[PDB]
Amino acid sequence: GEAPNQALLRILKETEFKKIKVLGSGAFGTVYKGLWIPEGEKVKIPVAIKELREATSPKANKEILDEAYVMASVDNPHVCRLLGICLTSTVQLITQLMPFGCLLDYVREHKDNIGSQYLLNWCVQIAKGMNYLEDRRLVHRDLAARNVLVKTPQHVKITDFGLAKLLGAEEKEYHAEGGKVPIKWMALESILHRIYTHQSDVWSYGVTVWELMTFGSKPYDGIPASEISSILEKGERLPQPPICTIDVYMIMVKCWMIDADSRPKFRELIIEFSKMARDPQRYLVIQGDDMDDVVDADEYLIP
Amino acid sequence: GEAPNQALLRILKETEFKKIKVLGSGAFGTVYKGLWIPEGEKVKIPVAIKELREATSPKANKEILDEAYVMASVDNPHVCRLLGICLTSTVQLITQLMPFGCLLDYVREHKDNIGSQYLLNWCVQIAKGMNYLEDRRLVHRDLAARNVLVKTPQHVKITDFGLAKLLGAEEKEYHAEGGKVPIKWMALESILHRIYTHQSDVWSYGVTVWELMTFGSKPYDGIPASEISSILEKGERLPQPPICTIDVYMIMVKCWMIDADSRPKFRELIIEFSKMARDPQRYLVIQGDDMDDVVDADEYLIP
Ligand SMILES: OC[C@@H](Nc1ncnc2oc(-c3ccccc3)c(-c3ccccc3)c12)c1ccccc1
Ligand SMILES: OC[C@@H](Nc1ncnc2oc(-c3ccccc3)c(-c3ccccc3)c12)c1ccccc1
């Protein structure tokens, strides 16, 4: 009836891996940096180890397992995949370490050294990952610069599948209920009707691109989430970033059409950004890529 | 009778240049970082501005002017040259800013990123500068890693001519009297008889090279300057640095022969280090240029 999910859920022993340092700790528990050393092999795999707050909330324990189900069911160079789980007091999620952290923080603390080639290549990679998830029938529902991690400066992967949902063969959209989704990244239909689709992800992809192009600006910086619904209905959108040619900014605007089907598909976004990646300075204008009368002393020969 | 020194001593107005920041302040007064803006031109020259301690010692004021005389009389890509002096309360020496500071500090705080190409190229450049000073009939008497400055990582210049002395046409050596010269960089004959020659500079060049090859180690670290004379007489020399092939270390040892004329000339040191610079990894072994079983998670495919 539907394609049976034959993903393997690997169960890891706690003695196999070693926590080196804490990486971060929000309201989702704590993420550790560590090494995973399978006893049989002669390998040492750098891993990120996520566990919820020491306590046990019935609902929160289930949701980590949902995140495990989706991560275990994905396999793509531009998507983060689960290595396994460890069944300790609280369940631990284990994945490949992305040492350079989330892309939002990366663009912020490297503004001065990020060229148009990297920006456009990241857009291509995120589009490929999202396109893969579309093929896998998966709606992410939380795509943002913060949920894209950096393996190396030239290789990024999508992560954070805690809100992700699998769509059936005879199913085109997901209907939420609980809410509490980041308002500033979601499509109008999702705010107005809690409808989520692959094209809702495209909206979020648009906002994710805006983040990258503005080197990590906060969308609608001065605006409270209550108003967001209203301003979108009126036709107001995120502004054109300084470095963005109309060509690039038109792609972003297309992701934010009211009609979801009028928005571009991830496969089309791969093509368009790929074309642009071939001649990146034609599409992004960055000054890099306090005086200009300065001359070195051994070019100023004595008069 | 002797070649008349027709060097031009430029006198600069204080209003022409602007102190931005203090760079350092030992027992030689203070060195400022600044910009020099000749009124007529549309240029802004980055300069280092040296002045003695606010007060006026009769002997100390003379010695700054001696340093000005020698710096003003030199013109070579690998030697620091005086731009001018400013006749304020205390005399100010003005020269080209070498933004990366002295080479001793540079090798120390970049151990991990200094390759054999840079090390050997620096040796060539210092040899060229010293060879130029030899042609100019100038004995430096204070060559060390600390007295070589860095314009860029790939371009260094010799500086600090406070102890330098001009030799006459019919003159092969200088006889000091006051003393107080860095003992660990000077040749045996200079310690034993206060004799200084171009070949005494070669000894110091040998020690300067040892500093670079050991990434800024202090020569005879545990030894007090009183003993230095004795250990050299016995035949003890600075040890072979870990990264140094016998080829390179033999050059260093040759600079430390008792017979000054047995030591190599700077022109020969230019040639030898130049040859080596063409195939630098044959002559310096640096690991760059905590586990080795580490494999990235997306090269460890699930068994
Ligand atoms: O977002 C959850 C995701 N976290 C990471 N995953 C891989 N590699 C990472 O690297 C950093 C990281 C590395 C260096 C500096 C900062 C962060 C974080 C990570 C850690 C804390 C919060 C968010 C991401 C991180 C995760 C998901 C499932 C299982 C474990 C971990
Ligand atoms: O050694 C005296 C020499 N000094 C420098 N000269 C050029 N460029 C420099 O750059 C730094 C420097 C720059 C950045 C960090 C640290 C040092 C120093 C310099 C400053 C203080 C002591 C020694 C050298 C320095 C000098 C000689 C004559 C006139 C002025 C200055």
Swiss-Prot record, chains A, B:
Substitution effect: residue 74 to M: Found in a lung cancer sample
Consequence of substituting residue 143 to V: Found in a lung cancer sample; more sensitive to gefitinib than wild-type
Effect of residue 53 to P: Found in a lung cancer sample
UniProt effect for mutating residue 163 to R: Found in a lung cancer sample; somatic mutation; constitutively activated enzyme with strongly increased kinase activity; more sensitive to gefitinib than wild-type
Active site, per annotation: 142 (proton acceptor)
Cross-link (Glycyl lysine isopeptide (Lys-Gly) (interchain with G-Cter in ubiquitin)): 21, 42, 59, 62, 172, 234, 265, 275
Mutagenesis or variant effect for residue 166 to Q: Found in a lung cancer sample; constitutively activated kinase with higher levels of basal autophosphorylation; more sensitive to gefitinib than wild-type
Example of a GO MF term: protein tyrosine kinase activator activity
Domain of life: Eukaryota
A biological-process GO annotation: negative regulation of epidermal growth factor receptor signaling pathway
Modifications after synthesis and translation: Phosphorylated on Tyr residues in response to EGF. Dephosphorylation by PTPRJ prevents endocytosis and stabilizes the receptor at the plasma membrane. Dephosphorylated by PTPN1 and PTPN2. Monoubiquitinated and polyubiquitinated upon EGF stimulation; which does not affect tyrosine kinase activity or signaling capacity but may play a role in lysosomal targeting. Polyubiquitin linkage is mainly through 'Lys-63', but linkage through 'Lys-48', 'Lys-11' and 'Lys-29' also occurs. Deubiquitination by OTUD7B prevents degradation. Ubiquitinated by RNF115 and RNF126. Ubiquitinated by ZNRF1 or CBL at different lysines in response to EGF stimulation; leading to recruitment of the ESCRT machinery and subsequent degradation in the lysosomes.
UniProt key word Transmembrane helix: yes
Site label Important for interaction with PIK3C2B, positions: 300
Tissue-wise expression: Ubiquitously expressed. Isoform 2 is also expressed in ovarian cancers.
Phenotypic consequence of residue 24 to A: Found in a lung cancer sample
Subcellular location as annotated: Cell membrane; Endoplasmic reticulum membrane; Golgi apparatus membrane; Nucleus membrane
Reported effect, residue 4 to A: Reduced phosphorylation
Keywords from the UniProt entry: ATP-binding, Cell membrane, Developmental protein, Disease variant, Disulfide bond, Endoplasmic reticulum, Endosome, Glycoprotein, Golgi apparatus, Host cell receptor for virus entry, Host-virus interaction, Hydroxylation, Isopeptide bond, Kinase, Lipoprotein, Membrane, Methylation, Nucleotide-binding, Nucleus, Palmitate, Phosphoprotein, Proto-oncogene, Receptor, Repeat, Secreted, Signal, Transferase, Transmembrane, Transmembrane helix, Tyrosine-protein kinase, Ubl conjugation
Cellular compartments per GO CC: basal plasma membrane; basolateral plasma membrane; cell junction; cell surface; ciliary basal body; cilium; clathrin-coated endocytic vesicle membrane; cytoplasm
Record family assignment: Belongs to the protein kinase superfamily. Tyr protein kinase family. EGF receptor subfamily.
Function of the molecule: Receptor tyrosine kinase binding ligands of the EGF family and activating several signaling cascades to convert extracellular cues into appropriate cellular responses. Known ligands include EGF, TGFA/TGF-alpha, AREG, epigen/EPGN, BTC/betacellulin, epiregulin/EREG and HBEGF/heparin-binding EGF. Ligand binding triggers receptor homo- and/or heterodimerization and autophosphorylation on key cytoplasmic residues. The phosphorylated receptor recruits adapter proteins like GRB2 which in turn activates complex downstream signaling cascades.
Record: disease: Lung cancer: A common malignancy affecting tissues of the lung. The most common form of lung cancer is non-small cell lung cancer (NSCLC) that can be divided into 3 major histologic subtypes: squamous cell carcinoma, adenocarcinoma, and large cell lung cancer. NSCLC is often diagnosed at an advanced stage and has a poor prognosis. Neonatal nephrocutaneous inflammatory syndrome: An autosomal recessive disorder characterized by intrauterine growth retardation, premature birth, fragile skin, recurrent skin infections and sepsis, failure to thrive, nephrocalcinosis, and nephromegaly with tubular dysfunction. Some patients have chronic diarrhea, and necrotizing enterocolitis.
Protein name per UniProt: Epidermal growth factor receptor
Organism, as annotated: Homo sapiens
Phylogenetic placement of the source organism: Eukaryota, Metazoa, Chordata, Craniata, Vertebrata
Name of the gene encoding the protein in the UniProt record: EGFR
First-to-last residue of the parent protein present: 696 to 1019 of 1210
